């Protein structure tokens, strides 16, 4: 399982593949690891499914409530922080999970969060089993001067690479791009596999 969030100009793109496995026993081919969490933000799950899912629900509801009560959306740094607090608070009986949360408020952001509530922002970050491989192609071809369209390709490549060197990753790679103009939008399956074909990639 590999996911990645990347920041650029006036957008943030998040993508993951979706193979859920039990050791070597790949039991589920189409899991879901990318979730819209708020009008202008998404989250990627990686780690132990149970812990991940309930955490997504909490976050989701917690956000919606805040919105209503404050009449405004919660800032990304704020959501990251809340999540940081929740995780660390129970560090000694932790939600074995690795979260990546991205979104755009006044500007784009993407924070990497660990099971002990350690929270840090970067311009792009990968999470999960295939992390290294992607971190390689990213360290290699990522440029802040890229277009939202160039990005989606990069991302797709990056993951397709990790899909090659990591048995724990696989299945249809899917991406969502969130911008202030159109909000959080998840690209259409066909369009994605199309770029795959176009890029000469596989699976």
């Amino acid at each position: 399982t590999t996911t990645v969030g990347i920041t650029l100009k006036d957008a943030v793109i998040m993508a993951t593949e979706r193979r859920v496995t039990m050791e070597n026993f790949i039991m589920h081919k189409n899991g879901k690891k990318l979730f819209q969490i708020d009008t202008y933000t998404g989250m990627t799950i990686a780690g132990l499914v149970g812990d991940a899912q309930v955490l997504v629900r909490y976050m989701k509801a917690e956000l919606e409530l805040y919105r209503l009560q404050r009449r405004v959306n919660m800032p990304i740094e704020a959501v990251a922080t809340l999540l940081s607090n929740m995780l660390n608070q129970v560090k000694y009986m932790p939600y074995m999970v690795q979260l990546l949360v991205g979104g755009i408020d006044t500007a784009p952001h993407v924070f990497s969060i660990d099971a002990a509530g350690g929270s840090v922002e970067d311009i792009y970050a990968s999470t999960g089993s295939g992390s290294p491989f992607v971190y390689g192609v990213l360290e290699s071809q990522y440029s802040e001067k890229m277009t939202v369209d160039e990005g989606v390709d990069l991302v797709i490549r990056a993951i397709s690479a990790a899909k090659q060197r990591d048995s724990a990753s696989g299945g249809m790679i899917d991406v969502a791009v969130i911008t202030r103009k159109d909000g959080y939008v998840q690209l259409p399956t066909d369009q994605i596999e199309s770029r795959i074909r176009k890029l000469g990639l596989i699976l």
């Binding site: 629900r57 909490y58 989701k60 509801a61 917690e62 919606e64 409530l65 209503l68 009560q69």
Partner: protein, 221 residues
Amino acid sequence: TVFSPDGRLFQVEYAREAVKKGSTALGMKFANGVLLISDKKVRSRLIEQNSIEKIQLIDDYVAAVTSGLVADARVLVDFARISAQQEKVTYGSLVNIENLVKRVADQMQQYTQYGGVRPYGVSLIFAGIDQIGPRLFDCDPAGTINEYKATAIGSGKDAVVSFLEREYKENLPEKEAVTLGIKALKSSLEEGEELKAPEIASITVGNKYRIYDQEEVKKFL
């Protein structure tokens, strides 16, 4: 709170009084949705207009409006809110809205009997579309709940309710529905002529709630 020799909880009765002295509002099912409309009666220029929202959202598919002791209404509203999240987080979906109102209702019913605690002097109505379809419920201080085709609450209850009781049109399309209502709201409290600025919101099956903008409402006004 205890029983009178005639089988009545006077305290709860008194509470009802407080609600009668509250703002008038109503709601009604129509075409393929439900709408809410409350009389936003403002005083000073110094009030921050819109900020005195009477129609509040519990969740993108369910709103409720209240009348009675303002403080009691607020706290009760927030209760309904977190309670909504609860069902969403355990079941993954607020399937039947009737249940949400039931929960807030029981909250209220508890203060009708557990000795040392004053009852909630507020009534409110919940409206929205759930798994079953568009739904409309009202709730009094006594914890009593009922589903309606259309209803009102607050000061001009009796009045407006009668108007509808007579001229309510079953499957009235939104535009006309909002009209029949504003008219009905008018007649009622409009002993004092000026309808002022009504607060209105409507949702229809298939989508999220919509709050009417100052101009749009003024159009029906």
